[PDB]
Design a protein around this ligand. Structure first.
Ligand SMILES: [Ca+2]
Lengths: 23, 140
């Protein structure tokens, strides 16, 4: 079921995004 | 006793941080992490709701929910934003647990977090300039 992986991966992609927008 | 002291210190650190002043190194970090969570959570709020919907939690599957989101979060390494998500995630998990009448898990989750943070993020943190780095490069 695709949205299982997807919701996890999106947390990680947000963290990476947060990682650069707050420096 | 000394629990009068915990109360006094807590009241003072809070009052101090409002004025920009920080009681200890630990008071600084607690504040930087709190502010970063609230900020992460508000910015990626949609990303969080999608998370809640996909995972019903019971006391038997709560850990599975935890390890799945955590292992995916740190799949190909570590950074500070990912570390914020980790904290933000566990805070959300703890809130869903109390919501769904399962308050027992709250301390379990904290322990899972502490051990992971201790045994799995600490080496990266110690090697990237400790907690003071992230206070100084992300905080404020
Ligand atoms: Ca496992």
């Amino acid at each position: 079921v695709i949205p299982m992986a997807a919701v996890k991966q999106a947390l990680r992609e947000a963290g990476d995004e947060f990682e650069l927008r707050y420096r | 006793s000394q629990s009068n002291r915990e109360l006094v210190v807590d009241f003072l650190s809070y009052k101090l941080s409002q004025k920009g002043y920080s009681w200890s190194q630990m008071a600084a970090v607690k504040q930087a992490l709190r502010e970063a969570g609230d900020e992460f959570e508000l910015r990626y709020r949609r990303a969080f709701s999608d998370l809640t919907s996909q995972l019903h939690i019971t006391p038997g599957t709560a850990y599975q929910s935890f390890e799945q989101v955590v292992n995916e979060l740190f799949r190909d390494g570590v950074n500070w934003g990912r570390i914020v998500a980790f904290f933000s995630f566990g805070g959300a998990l703890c809130v869903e647990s109390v919501d769904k009448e399962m308050q027992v898990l709250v301390s379990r989750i904290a322990a899972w977090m502490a051990t992971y943070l201790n045994d799995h993020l600490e080496p990266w943190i110690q090697e990237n300039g400790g907690w003071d780095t992230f206070v100084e490069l992300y905080g404020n």
